[PDB]
């Protein structure tokens, strides 16, 4: 009786891995079914499954941002799921839509997420009311030489800097009753140039360091040297373990207008190569029940897009959640079409080149989209 179920979970050597290990053990306690939980980096799971899945060595359950759903559907990595109407009903509509591709549902949500303004309460009293003032605050307080900042964030990552292309009226793809068009990339429009002009000023005026990464942003904030970062819910537990008195506010309004961040839904998905699609959907349900997502929030800090859980005033008005949820409500879901995968590397290289003073915002952007359009073809044929 060789009966095992395999789950791939983010390799955080901590809170996200642990929670899924716990609830997968309870399922093993309840059903007798052996459920192994392999830690695989959130962003490395899709490529691993591309190799392992068709070789019978893949996981049954996998997870990554809804960002890359569609490419996975197109590449035969995932199969749709069938769950009861009552189960389907327990989840946030925005979350469930982000997990739906070509009319079909590919997963159950674990987390609804957006970046917000997270601040060290002993360095920042009240949050700057506007973006202009948040910026002037960075201009005045940032000092790379002493490694102390008023504002630090991944200003070389398009996932972070997007509220800022969006403020200018720039989009990733064209608006044909949605995000329906792969062939009309808006990332080299005049409004996109203005957005990159704003990214540039973060390295030019606000003097953010070149070669930034999440480790640099987190480490400096944790060592108490940064007043405020732009980061997401996933970082809170880590900050609080380092003992920061974290406050969470929405992003200060920009141009007298709501900041428009990306919205990310992290889901469990069913591998198209799972030999046990029925029993794995059962597992996926067990992992996303109200009781499991209650415990996940408390352990990971990651906001579950479960309707009854979002309802609770102890979760809705929690100061460490409130700001994220409000900002999330002002956001747009990341596009989920197959050709979104093409965007990340070019546009982020374009950020590095501008930040570095190697290429102008106009040339960096024009180069980026030409590369993007070229890659749309490698997908085809
Ligand atoms: O960074 C070092 C890693 O290098 C190597 O990884 C490379 C990849 O192999 C390569 O493919 C490429 O990545 C591309 C990627 O595959 C594409 O998906 C895409 O990515 C975009 C994505 O699709 C969008 O959704 C968005 O991402 C945002 C995301 O939605 C949002 O959730 C958030 O992510 C946060 C996490 O949710 C949160 O958990 C936390 O992450 C922690 C992590 O939990 C913890 O374990 C630790 O991570 C380790 C990691 O486990 C190690 O594996 C190692 O990573 C290297 C890889 O192994 C290499 O293969 O070290 C990590 C230490 O940093 O720490 C994390 C930090 O706290 O926070 C996350 C945010 O910080 O935000 C993301 C935005 O960042 O946008 C994505 C694009 O920006 O495009 C990718 C690029 O083309 O390149 C990889 C980099 O070398």
Residue 9: give its domain's CATH number. 3.40.190.10
Total residue count of the chain as it appears in this document: 381
One domain for residues 125 and 218: yes
With tokens 């940032």, the residue in question is 142
Q: Which structural technique was applied?
A: X-ray
Instruction: Compute the distance between CA of residue 333 and CA of residue 183 in angstroms, rounded to an integer.
Output: 19
Angle between helices 290-300 and 277-288 (to 10 degrees): 60
Which among 220, 201, 222, 200 is positioned nearest to 146, based on CA atoms?
220
Sign of CA dihedral 300, 304, 308, 314: positive
For the record, the structure tokens of 366 come out as: 């024009």
One domain for residues 172 and 244: yes
Q: Which of 12, 19, 20, 41 to mutate to test the pocket of ligand 1 (most atoms within 8 A of CB)?
A: 41
Given a contact cutoff of 8 angstroms between Cβ atoms, the answer to whether 247 and 149 are in contact is no
CB of 68 shorter than 6 A to ligand 1: yes
Range of the domain at 14: 1-114+262-335
CB of 11 shorter than 6 A to ligand 1: yes
CB of 42 shorter than 6 A to ligand 1: yes
Instruction: Compute the distance between CA of residue 269 and CA of residue 179 in angstroms, rounded to an integer.
Output: 23
How far is residue 185 from each of residues 273, 335, 369, measured CA to CA in Å?
A: 33, 12, 7
Per the structure, the count of domains in the chain is 2
Within its chain, how far is the Cα of 302 from the centroid?
Answer: 11
Phi-psi region of 323 (alpha: psi -120 to 50; beta: other; left: phi over 0): alpha
Residue 175 burial (CB < 10 Å; 0-12/13-18/19+)? Answer: exposed
Residue nearest to atom 27 of ligand 1 (CA): 159
Residue 334 Cα: closest atom of ligand 1 = 25
How far is residue 188 from each of residues 62, 114, 332, measured CA to CA in Å?
A: 34, 25, 20
Give me the resolution in angstroms, 1 decimal: 2.5
One domain for residues 214 and 142: yes
Residue 153 pairs in a beta bridge with 230
Other beta carbons less than 10 A from residue 280's beta carbon = 25
One domain for residues 257 and 192: yes
Phi-psi region of 102 (alpha: psi -120 to 50; beta: other; left: phi over 0): left
One domain for residues 103 and 195: no
- CA–centroid distance, residue 42 to ligand 1 (Å): 7
Sign of CA dihedral 204, 206, 211, 214: negative
One domain for residues 206 and 313: no
Instruction: Compute the distance between CA of residue 213 and CA of residue 40 in angstroms, rounded to an integer.
Output: 20
- Of 335, 353, 371, which residue constitutes the final position of a domain? 335
- CA–centroid distance, residue 43 to ligand 1 (Å): 5
One domain for residues 249 and 359: yes
For the record, the structure tokens of 133 come out as: 């003032």
Residue 13 Cα: closest atom of ligand 1 = 46
- Helix (H) or strand (E) run with residue 271 in it: strand 262-271
One domain for residues 192 and 47: no
For the chain, where are the alpha helices, taking DSSP H only? Answer: 15-31, 45-52, 71-74, 85-89, 93-98, 131-141, 158-165, 190-204, 214-222, 236-241, 277-288, 290-300, 307-311, 313-316, 319-328, 341-355, 361-379
Residue nearest to atom 22 of ligand 1 (CA): 67
CB of 67 shorter than 6 A to ligand 1: yes
CB of 218 shorter than 6 A to ligand 1: yes
Residue 158 Cα: closest atom of ligand 1 = 80
No. of helices (H) and no. of strands (E), the chain: 17, 15
CB of 41 shorter than 6 A to ligand 1: yes
Instruction: Compute the distance between CA of residue 111 and CA of residue 224 in angstroms, rounded to an integer.
Output: 28
């Amino acid at each position: 009786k060789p009966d095992k179920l395999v789950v791939w979970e983010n390799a955080d050597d901590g809170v996200q891995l642990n929670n899924t290990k716990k609830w997968a053990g309870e399922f093993t306690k309840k059903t007798g079914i052996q459920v192994e939980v392999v830690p695989v980096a959130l962003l490395k799971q899709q490529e691993k499954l591309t190799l392992d899945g068709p070789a019978g060595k893949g996981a049954d359950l996998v997870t990554w941002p809804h960002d890359r759903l569609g490419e996975a559907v197109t590449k035969g990595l995932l199969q749709p799921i069938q769950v009861d109407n009552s189960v389907k009903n327990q989840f946030d509509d925005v979350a469930m839509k982000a997990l739906t591709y070509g009319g079909k549902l590919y997963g159950l949500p674990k987390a609804i997420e957006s970046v917000a303004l997270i601040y060290n309460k002993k360095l920042m009293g009240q949050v700057p009311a506007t973006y202009d003032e948040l910026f002037q605050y960075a201009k005045a307080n940032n000092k790379p030489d002493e490694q102390k900042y008023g504002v630090l964030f991944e200003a070389n990552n398009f996932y972070y800097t997007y509220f800022l292309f969006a403020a200018k009226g720039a989009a990733v793809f064209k608006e044909q009753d949605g995000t329906l068009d792969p062939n009309e990339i808006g990332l080299n429009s005049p409004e996109a140039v203005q957005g990159m002009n704003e990214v540039q000023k973060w390295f030019t005026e606000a003097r953010l360091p070149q070669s930034l990464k999440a480790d640099t942003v987190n480490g400096l904030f944790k060592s108490g040297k940064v007043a405020a970062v732009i980061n997401g819910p996933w970082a809170i537990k880590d900050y609080q373990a380092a003992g920061i008195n974290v406050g969470v506010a929405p992003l200060p309004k920009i141009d007298g207008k709501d900041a428009q961040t990306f919205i990310g839904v992290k889901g469990w998905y069913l591998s198209a190569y799972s030999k046990y699609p029925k029993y794995a959907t059962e597992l996926m349900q067990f992992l996303t029940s109200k009781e499991a997502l209650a415990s996940r929030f408390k352990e990971t800090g990651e906001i579950p897009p479960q309707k009854e859980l979002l309802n609770d005033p102890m979760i809705k008005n929690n100061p460490v959640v409130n700001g994220f949820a409000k900002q999330a409500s002002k956001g747009v879901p990341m596009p989920s079409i197959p050709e979104m995968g093409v965007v990340w590397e070019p546009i982020n290289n374009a950020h590095t080149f501008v930040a570095q003073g190697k290429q102008t915002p106009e040339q960096a952007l024009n180069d980026a989209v030409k590369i993007m359009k070229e890659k749309i073809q490698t997908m085809k044929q």
